[PDB]
Point group: C5
């Protein structure tokens, strides 16, 4: 067997997947939820085809593909992109596990790279069947009419619905070229409504401001430093 | 088994295949027929070697290789190019299914990239045996004397005929560098005669005009906008 | 099993192979013989690793690797280059078949890319053993002393001789950069002497003249057309 | 199987691994310890996927992946980088061996590429569990809070701890672009404290000085030589 | 099984291997010995992963990897480089054969690419164990202290010694960028002393002179020809 899921059964699990993707939208959202709900590391994906590494998080070695849990919610995180065939093999194992445990919901978190000059960033959605499309509509999420969703999200959407599970994908609009905690927040907001979780997305919006403030400040200091050096060169040498 | 066909039996099926190819001729033709005959999604190809995705069509997740049906006609569609060995594996499974169900006809839809400065775009044809060549001649389709037909179309032509099925390929002449709904229409016209379907190719010809009108109009507005900006720069700054 | 030879037994077969190669010498020679001896398509090579296609010849679908026959002569043709390991696998199956049927002769047709400024184009030869070298000498074919022969020809030469079959390769000298029906003719001439076939190589030499006449004429008309356009531009605009 | 560990059992082994990596920090450290503790070559990794070579050390042929030993300490050395899947396969076999022999400690030596203009080069650490983190803290090694450790080190850290073994990684800060015996020395110092070995890191610090002195001296002589040649050209030819 | 050695048993064989490598030193040496000792072609390596070809030597088809013999000495020759894993597989089969027949010596011939401006070209050596190092010392061959020997030579050295066979590598220093019959001669001289063969290396040194004389002469005639053409252009056209 190329891929082994090492993951305890969690009956009627709500499974949320945020693999790396455009904007890191899914990934930031999933990681934020795992943190804010004080989830434990409950399992991981094991395969010879996952390249050798340990991530170190709060001084604990963790594998690159892992599962976090707090009673009934599982969150699936990855820190690497993976080749297509391996993704498919992992998706197979995940869907087997979700059938086994009669998972209540299968939710994939994703990003949609969508220009620069858009006023507000929406969250789009798609459901396994018309029933799930209706649910998403009733949380005021725009349903995606035409498109493609590649990667784990796209495969889970199809595979999980085909196995009779209620499956969804949320796609936060983002620039498409950078980590975007704001778009992740939009997605986490939709997830609050969907699951009644009441997690504040403030720390996420704070994080975004602090990054942008830091960038502005570093650019200021860089340019101020070269202007000082030019003025200094001229007074010394003209 | 590398490829699983998930497809109910349709006795004495007329199987039509329009995989992506030059001009998207086959693909547009097949997709148009599926739509205009209000076909249902009846099946799909499943394989670890098909890269992970869902297509979203009218807000429903669908796999990239799928089958549409309406009583006795099956239409095979793909939204991705596929590597040669996988194509061969899919062809094997398709031909097995068509033997099983005693398919009446196996028709591949394709394009022939053929210059720019040709007055009219023809439709060529080829049959599994001289019997099918004769049929195509009697619908005034030119028989291809010398050529190669690569991809699924070429393989099905040979494999299906070798298994005792009546097999054909229709090739719409096209530019060779762009989606061509007009050439698809030519092919759909030939398919009407062949199967007595009376599907209007008007919406297809309309679609082509609207695309071209839109392009012309956007190019007009683009060029008019830069001329305005030049005039504006000059009045402001000369 | 990666490669299946679908080929009826032909006792004491004279097997001639002309796979694509420098100059298309082998290939043109083999194809010409098959045509001029009104051979039938008697079989083919079947493998998932042969890329999907049908060639269309005289309006009949044929596979890319095929066998032509007329009582006791088999001619093996291919329309594609193939990767080394697959070539070896095909060679194995071919040699098994030739042992089975006690083949009388195993002849590979090939080209030798050899400069531009040579007056005459020779045909070289090599035999499985000194006995076959002697035969070739007695038809005034130069024996190749040192060299390598890659591809199917080289493998068959060795494998067929090692299985106790009389094996040969004929190599028509050619430019090395273009289809050369003249060099093919040289090879077919040697094959006439070797097998007493009396096939005229005139149509081949005719074909070469007509191609060269067409090229000269097109180049004339091209250059005459731009001279006319220059004269026309000058009279219009000076 | 694809990888065979040829290695005698050493009960309750202290296993130290220094595979090549940034700075050659791990590698230099491990190699130095093996030498200074007069270890014997006790085993090696054998695999068809290890490229064919012998290293020659003190006139003895040795394989590229080898194990050195002196009563209870095993040191694992490699002289080549290896592809990820092979690394994982080797890690599997190593961890199996370490379970078998109830290894006391599993220590990976590594480097951390970390800029140029840093005052001191530290040594960081990480442990399989909080118990080992505590040990490292009590030798005044900074515990790594966040990061990733790729390669054999990262995999062993996780795999060995998951099999109930006490596992650690030491990471010497280094420039990141060159062999760094100084950083290796820092790591060997930490290893002395951890295992009570009292190995002098002087020869290592000496080695670093001699390399740097040699570089400076060669650059001096090069530049002095071209200045002499310029002066000589001018006196000869002006 | 990927590689079959077709090679009669030769009890207590002296096995000499000269696979292509830097300078073609090994290869020229091995080939020269096979010729000068009037060896017969006794066997070959057979594998689907050896690319299809025949070499033609004195008008006989031979495989690219072959074995020459004269009572008790086997010489292994290859005319192609091979991928690492295949080399390892061939080495496995060779060492199995050498255990089977209780081979007396396993000698690899190789080159060491080593600059341009060296007065004399030495021959270095290395032995499987200290016993063989001593033998080589007693024929005044310098023992290599540190280095790596890649390819078949390196693998045989290790594998054959690990199977209890007496194994050696001789490395002729050479430029590193061209066929070097002189360095091959140096190696053949050492092989004479080692095995008491008294083969004159004169024809080899003669061959080198004739090549160099030919090069000088061709370069002379080339340059003399363009000078003549310049003089001729000037007298015609000034
Ligand atoms: Cl990341
Ligand atoms: Cl200045
Ligand atoms: Cl498309
Ligand atoms: Cl201006
Ligand atoms: Cl061709
Ligand atoms: Cl190294
Ligand atoms: Cl001067
Ligand atoms: Cl060579």
């Amino acid at each position: 067997k190329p891929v082994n899921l090492v993951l305890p059964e969690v009956e009627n699990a709500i499974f949320i997947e945020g693999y790396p993707g455009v904007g890191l939208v899914g990934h930031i959202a999933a990681n934020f939820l795992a943190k804010e709900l004080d989830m434990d590391l409950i399992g991981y994906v094991d395969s010879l085809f996952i390249p050798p590494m340990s991530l170190i998080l709060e001084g604990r070695p963790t594998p690159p593909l892992r599962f976090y849990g707090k009673n009934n919610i599982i969150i699936a995180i990855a820190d690497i992109f993976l080749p297509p065939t391996l993704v498919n093999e992992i998706a197979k194992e995940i869907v087997n596990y979700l059938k086994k445990v009669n998972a209540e919901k299968v939710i994939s978190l994703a990003g949609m790279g969508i220009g620069f000059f858009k006023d507000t960033f929406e969250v789009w959605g798609i459901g396994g069947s018309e029933e799930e499309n209706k649910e998403l509509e009733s949380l005021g999420v725009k349903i995606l009419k035409y498109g493609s969703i590649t990667g784990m999200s796209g495969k889970l959407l199809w595979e999980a619905s085909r196995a009779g599970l209620k499956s969804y994908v949320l796609l936060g609009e983002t620039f498409g070229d950078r980590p975007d905690p704001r778009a992740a927040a939009n997605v986490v907001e939709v997830l609050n409504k969907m699951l009644g979780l009441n997690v504040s997305v403030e720390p996420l919006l704070k994080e975004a401001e602090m990054i942008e403030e830091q960038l502005r400040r570093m650019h200021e200091q860089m340019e101020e430093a070269r202007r000082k050096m030019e003025r200094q060169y001229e007074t010394m040498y003209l």
